[PDB]
Design a protein around this ligand. Structure first.
Ligand SMILES: [Zn+2]
Lengths: 89, 176, 283, 275, 5
């Protein structure tokens, strides 16, 4: 947050930091999706991978919950993606 | 003398600038962080295959390659962290070369996957040296053109000697 | 007779597979060297002596916790200067025949290896050769059948639990370099799968994970991996560069004045590699 | 029996206060330490240890090393081991410790202004001239003597930030090490073990990755990356009564320690120097 | 290339 603030005392700096993190994350997520597009998804998730995902999500949620913090079309689409609401369009 | 070494430094900068477009590679995003991978040179490997690559040395003259950088205006007495950064850079270069030599075979299978050609024994070393030289160019960009005619620094020279001894021994160990 | 009809008795059992090695030449008496540890009912199915002799590995315990849980772990006996085949801590099914000198050791141990490693062709070859070698019928046949039955009993004890662990959801293990940004890790999980069920159990008992996520808490035992796995098998190699110095102080004045009774850090190199996950304690 | 127990040269100049000074015996050991084990533990969260290097027949190179006393949850100040002069006053609760200890810390970090402030404050103690000034003289002289002893400039190729792969550039941990006092530098050398040891073109690696971190804040029991390393630690009562009189017990235990492993030590043509 | 050298 301080490194980003170097570029200014932006009003929504916390939201901005979260957005930048999630955007850098989505870049590599698009990379993975491109790598896997050709492959065929299954009707249901791989159970082992699903367990790993749940277990790691536990820790991720714990950390980001412990750290409490403080022009609409594309903005809201991307924000919905950030919040993982896959109903985004 | 060390003036010739300054000439060497300028020449390596200009010659890197030259070949990075004579052969249009500039894989300039990479560094010495760890062992390089063919995944970042696939096309560069294809272009390399267009030339016979046996005109390369098994060993690396880590000494002469890095000594020119040691010539800088350390007398400014403002950034000794610059000298410490140089020490870090040289040590990490030595580690990079040592790991490349130790796992040279592993890279050989990597580049067997990527462009399975007889010249791979030289392509591995060419990738190593070219990524290293891109890192050298980036380091030159980072530092300032404060090269003096002559400058003594016993500590840096000693670090160079001791690390490069390991580097040369490792490269020599590449038997065949 | 004294005992109740049948009524399988209960006693201790030597657990290391190699304890069953005996000279097929009945006229030649032989005793295998077994460490007493073999008689501990634990996950180890190899005694310390055989482990060190054949795999270059030594057992070790890692306290874990409030309630101090003890996690089994093995450690390197590999020196710093060992190279090539010497670095194969546990050979794969495609290399054990070479790493282990079948010619130099006893036929019974060769059969044991061809059983552990799923080499049915070699097992059958040995069985037929023993059928047509020496006084097979008299006692050599019974000795061979006893050794084979013991090995098969151990393997049948291990493999079902190993498969259940493989498909298990609550307990998950991943033998690879947790530093995914590395090249010496590879498809460590695939190689572990290639290994036999009993071999997989041994690997689990020996190699501790770099990290361990219990429910919601994660413990990082290392910021690095002390061993790797490739096609050759379990390799005592540093994934990133120079080998770790292994003094091997045992087995195969002012300084002390200051350094009288004084806590000393061991120079041993334990086995840390991969990721492990568990729900609840299950202990 | 020279007592090098720095932080035990503390006298409760206040009459109502008595300083027990219950600190470790090893201070009477003529070692490279200038602070014995209990002071080290209390004020730096370090436990003294020794790491043998060559121990075959009589070559007994036993490099010293201390251990983290920081779990895998502490952060920032809680994790800093040896704070820099810029932040030690904040990391240490100087106000919560005796003024003599504060003076010792200020001398160690060369906070002469704080030293002057402390003696000025002591000026206004009831028995100031009688014995407070004597205590000041004793403590100050002892601390100054220790500091001069540590400082090598008074009357070798160990690099601490030169191990860090993946670092962008710069190092500078050795810069801050230089900025430290002679006592602090000697403490760092004595407690922190270089991850690599090169002797006359012969490199030994002790860890596959350094355990400590050095930055502007000082010495930190942090990791170069990723999460922190796991680092765990009569009045007869009713509960103390035990019930009726009536599992790798047979195997040794590998310590769950986090020794200070960081840096590269380079040794020139000199052989296995054992003096 | 092992002979062209
Ligand atoms: Zn045994």
């Amino acid at each position: 947050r301080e490194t980003f603030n170097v570029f200014g005392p932006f009003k929504q700096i916390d939201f901005m930091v979260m957005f930048v993190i999630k955007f850098n994350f989505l870049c590599d997520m698009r990379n993975f999706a491109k790598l896997i597009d050709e492959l065929v998804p299954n009707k249901q998730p791989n159970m082992r991978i699903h367990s790993v995902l749940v277990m790691r999500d536990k820790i991720v949620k714990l950390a980001f919950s412990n750290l409490q913090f403080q022009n609409t079309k594309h903005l809201q689409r991307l924000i919905m993606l950030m919040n993982a609401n896959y109903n985004v369009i | 003398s060390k003036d010739i070494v300054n000439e060497k430094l300028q020449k390596i900068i200009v010659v890197t600038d030259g070949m990075k477009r004579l052969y249009e590679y500039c894989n300039c995003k990479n560094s010495l962080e760890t062992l390089p991978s063919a995944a970042n040179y696939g096309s560069l490997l294809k272009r390399l295959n267009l030339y016979n690559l046996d005109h390369i040395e098994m060993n690396v003259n880590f000494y002469e390659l890095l000594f020119p950088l040691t010539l800088y205006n350390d007398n400014d007495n403002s950034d000794k962290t610059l000298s410490h950064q140089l020490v870090n850079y040289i040590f990490l270069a030595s580690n990079y070369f040592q790991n490349c030599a130790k796992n040279f075979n592993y890279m050989r299978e990597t580049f067997n996957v990527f462009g399975p050609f007889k010249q791979i024994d030289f392509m591995v070393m060419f990738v190593i040296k070219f990524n290293f030289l891109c890192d050298m160019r980036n380091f030159a960009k980072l530092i300032d053109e404060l090269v003096p005619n002559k400058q003594p620094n016993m500590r840096i020279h000693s670090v160079l000697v001791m690390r490069d001894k390991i580097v040369k021994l490792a490269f020599s160990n590449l038997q065949f | 007779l004294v005992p109740v009809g049948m009524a399988p008795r209960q006693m201790r059992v030597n657990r290391c597979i190699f304890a069953s090695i005996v000279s097929f030449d009945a006229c030649i008496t032989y005793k295998s060297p077994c460490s007493p540890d073999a008689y501990h009912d634990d996950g180890w199915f190899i005694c310390n002596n055989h482990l060190i002799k054949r795999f270059k590995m030594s057992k070790m315990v890692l306290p874990i916790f409030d309630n101090q849980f003890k996690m089994t772990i093995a450690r390197h006996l590999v020196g710093n200067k060992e190279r090539g085949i010497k670095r194969i801590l546990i050979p794969s099914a495609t290399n054990y025949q070479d790493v282990f000198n079948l010619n130099s050791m006893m036929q019974a141990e060769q059969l044991i290896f061809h059983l552990i490693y799923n080499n049915e062709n070699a097992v059958n070859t040995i069985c037929d050769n023993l059928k047509y070698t020496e006084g097979f019928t008299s006692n050599t046949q019974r000795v061979i059948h006893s050794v084979y039955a013991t090995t098969k009993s151990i393997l049948d004890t291990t493999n079902p639990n190993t498969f259940c662990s493989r498909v298990s959801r609550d307990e998950l293990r991943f033998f690879d370099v947790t530093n995914a940004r590395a090249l010496r890790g590879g498809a460590g999980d695939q190689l572990f799968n290639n290994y036999s069920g009993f071999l997989q159990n041994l690997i689990r008992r020996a190699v501790a994970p770099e990290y361990l996520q219990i429910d919601t808490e994660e413990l990082r035992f290392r910021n690095c991996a002390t061993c790797i796995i490739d096609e050759t098998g379990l390799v005592a190699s540093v994934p990133d560069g120079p080998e770790l110095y292994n003094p091997i102080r045992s087995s195969d004045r002012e300084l002390d004045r200051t350094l009288s009774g004084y806590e000393e850090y061991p120079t041993y190199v334990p086995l840390f590699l991969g990721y492990q996950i568990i729900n609840s304690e299950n202990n």
